[PDB]
Design a protein around this ligand. Structure first.
Ligand SMILES: *[C@@H]1O[C@H](CO)[C@@H](O)[C@H](O)[C@H]1NC(C)=O
Ligand SMILES: *[C@@H]1O[C@H](CO)[C@@H](O)[C@H](O)[C@H]1NC(C)=O
Ligand SMILES: *[C@@H]1O[C@H](CO)[C@@H](O)[C@H](O)[C@H]1NC(C)=O
Ligand SMILES: *[C@@H]1O[C@H](CO)[C@@H](O)[C@H](O)[C@H]1NC(C)=O
Lengths: 481, 481
């Protein structure tokens, strides 16, 4: 929230009896400031005082017409306020009689003219005024000031050395209204008479700008559906159920009927009817109720590798499913299921898994309504591999001149049940490993080897094996008998 | 008071879904009938239904847009009623779907287009439509039907092959609005899209159509003073005591403000202010207070003739008098005075009177306020004339051979006091009358004349005389001695 701050303050004015005076006050703040006009100290009430508001609520214009003097001759003020703060600015109004209107006071030599431009074509409203010093020309539309501040806009104020005009680049229905030009200088202010501007739109039968688009949802179960029609003359947009009109009869709105539905208990068809004097046009929306999908058939494992598992499942649903979501995690991992989104078939291979691991699964169905309940789970296990790492911390030491003790720790990557180990040893480590002497052992971390020849350097290497095959050999260690 | 009677009854219709249908009902009666639209005994209440009233209250239009079937498909009725009677007429509405629109049903091939004509120039809106049988083209303005019934009017419908049109002679602000054309046949009715028509008035400063004209009146004491202004755009008219605005101070009407003043006590000036953005104009009315004039000075006779009397009088008033009224009658007439209106001075000669008659007179003063009390009367008498008719029934008869008896009746037109008579007689009626023998007599109707010569025819003539002179002689009678 921010307190109100002035974007545009009213200026002193010097008008002429039986004329117009306008005061402008704009302010910004959060929430939107209210603007109030005071004559010390009173909310202004009168038949000739009129407060006109900007469409954006930026503020308001105090318009005094016709000026009668010296009642109106006074100090007025604008107060902008929200529940965060308050600001005010004062301003003076002077009204003169033409008995005592100074010469050189702004005079309208020619005022704006009634004009009819068609849409999107450039219209020009013109103002000739003289005075000494030379009068500055400004414009008012529907009592509000016309903003031509941006040189870069549709609407630009041109002034030449001969007094100026207002140029509207691209016409809109919004442009239509009552324009008056205003000649000001250091002596005062004078208005021209109002000249209306009208804009002709070619007569067109009605047409749907935004037709009403079909839906499905679970019961109770609500939706707002928009029907927009446009054309000239702009039509009435009436929402019609088959025969009966929801909207009463006394009210048919223009160009926009948006329908609110509570508790869509049943499937239905609805009609949006738009009509003007040139025709009736119609358009239907299909409202049907269907639920979220049923849980899929329980997943079945039909393929497995050491790093993948392929699932197949029944759709479990009477109507077509858009796609599936597969839920997966390790048998005892307890974070919420990891999910693979956007699976467009009833079979999928989950890859990037680890060898010899237990996995948990479910399948979820998704249709246009949304996401259904997860299927019942299936448990399974990835295949084994040969180990992908050597036994760790391999050590050997002398027991006697003829026997040694070899030990190791389990490989970090067994990729399966360790069925055993193979111990390779030799006095010549340059041989191929298949030509070393070999000692097979069951699952264990230590063994003894005898019948060695004394006072020799033996090189030793160890691997693990699963049901699949041999793992890698440890790098050579040496032991001396 | 007269009961309501239909001038225009609605007709059955066959429209198309999401379109327009209009029903028309007009009726006349004293007092003005109200019109109510019923669907089965019940007043129809605006779904999208709209009842639009004629500016003269002659009736209303029931407009259904957009057409919905088969809800709207029903028997409707118009009921017209005042406190003198009640009437109704029924009508049927048929709405079709374009799924089932018959071949030959009216179609708009081109509908009216937006148009901008300036004031006092004729704009024409065009409509091309087809159908089988050929469609009849009609027009609606601002939802009310356009009456081109009088061939003799500003507004006439043109027809060629496959087209109709609307032609508006001399454009007026009233003509501005939203026009749509309508194609009808035995299959049904179809509307085009609405196209607005504009009438652009070149902008003008305000001006007084009916300025405020001064007054005088008695205290308490009331008057309505009217101020009218016109121009484009039409201005506001405010009444001012010359410093401040008369309450409702902020309320401002358009182009016509009339000030009602109750219980006037004093003389004053009032200011009427009309103002626009292109300038302010002012205008004053003078209110001053006093009653009808004081009665004039008693009239004085300064001239008299046998047929006229001239009056002179003092005005009797502190302020100027506009003119006078002279009252006159015979003195012994007990009927009300005859009056001579519009006498612009303080002297006047009343002519066409009868000789030697008594007359009564009075003078009345009139100012801008009104007519004052009559003056005190003056009595007088017209002058005498010589008689203007001869003595009547003149007869003479023998008394002796030397004397005759002459008698007569008074002239009908003495024009004065008969002072006497003169009897002319002779034996030679060929002489001039002044050479006859003569016998003067006082006021009487009979005389004797002697010393006549026997056995002779005497011719006799008699006249009357007043103080003025001799009247006419009777025609000759004869008497024999
Ligand atoms: C449905 O409409 C309500 C109405 O307030 C709105 O808040 C909600 O966001 C809408 N929901 C959807 C799913 O459009
Ligand atoms: C909805 O429209 C479809 C046409 O594809 C039709 O087969 C189905 O029976 C309609 N459903 C209802 C509930 O009317
Ligand atoms: C003055 O105005 C009132 C307003 O209704 C009207 O009734 C009355 O007849 C008017 N008087 C005159 C003298 O015009
Ligand atoms: C009204 O104004 C006139 C000037 O037109 C002035 O002579 C007169 O004295 C004024 N009367 C009053 C009562 O103010």
């Amino acid at each position: 929230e921010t307190p109100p701050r002035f974007t545009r303050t009213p200026v002193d004015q010097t008008g002429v009896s039986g004329g117009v005076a306008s005061f402008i006050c704009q302010a910004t703040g959060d929430p939107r400031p209210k603007i109030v006009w005071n004559k010390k100290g009173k909310k202004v009430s009168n038949q000739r005082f009129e407060v006109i508001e900007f469409d954006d609520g930026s503020g308001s214009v105090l318009r005094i017409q016709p000026l009668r003097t010296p009642r109106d001759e006074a100090i007025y003020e604008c107060v902008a306020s929200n529940n965060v703060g308050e600001i005010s600015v004062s301003t003076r109004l002077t009204v003169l009689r033409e008995d005592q209107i100074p010469r050189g006071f702004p005079t309208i030599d020619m005022g704006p003219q009634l004009k009819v431009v068609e849409r999107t074509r450039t219209a020009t409203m013109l103002c000739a005024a003289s005075g000494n010093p030379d009068p500055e020309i400004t414009w008012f539309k529907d009592f509000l000031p016309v903003d031509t501040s941006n040189n870069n806009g549709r609407i630009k104020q041109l002034r030449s050395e001969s007094i100026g005009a207002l140029q509207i680049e691209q016409s809109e229905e919004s442009d239509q209204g009552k324009y008056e030009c205003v000649a000001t200088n250091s002596a005062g202010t004078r208005y021209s008479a109002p000249a209306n501007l009208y804009v002709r739109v070619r007569r067109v039968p009605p047409r749907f700008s935004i037709p009403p688009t079909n839906h499905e949802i679970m019961p109770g179960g609500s939706v707002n559906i928009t029907c927009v029609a446009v054309g000239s003359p702009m039509p009435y947009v009436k929402w019609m159920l088959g025969a009966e009109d929801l909207t009463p009869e006394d009210d048919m709105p223009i160009g926009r009927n948006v329908l609110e539905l509570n508790d869509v208990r049943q499937s239905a068809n609805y009609t949006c009817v738009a009509m003007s004097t040139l025709g009736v046009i119609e358009a239907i929306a299909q409202i049907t109720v269907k639920a979220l999908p049923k849980p899929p058939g329980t997943p079945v494992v039909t393929e497995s590798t050491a790093t993948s598992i392929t699932l197949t499942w029944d759709s479990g649903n009477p109507e077509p499913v858009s796609y599936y979501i597969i839920q997966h995690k390790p048998k005892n991992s307890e974070e919420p299921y990891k999910e693979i989104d956007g699976i467009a078939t009833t079979r999928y291979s989950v890859a990037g898994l680890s060898p010899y691991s237990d996995y948990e699964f479910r399948v979820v169905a998704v249709n246009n309504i949304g996401r259904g309940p997860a299927s019942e789970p299936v448990l399974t296990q990835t295949s084994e591999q040969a180990p992908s790492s050597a036994p760790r911390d391999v050590q050997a030491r002398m027991l006697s001149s003829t026997t040694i003790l070899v030990q190791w720790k389990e490989p970090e990557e067994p990729n399966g049940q360790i069925q055993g180990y193979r111990v390779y040893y030799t006095m010549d480590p340059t041989q191929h490993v298949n030509n070393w002497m070999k000692h097979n052992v069951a699952d264990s971390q230590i063994t003894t080897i005898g019948n060695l020849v004394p006072q020799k350097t033996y090189s030793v290497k160890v691997l693990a094996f699963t049901s699949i095959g041999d793992g890698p050999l440890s790098s050579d260690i040496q032991v001396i008998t």
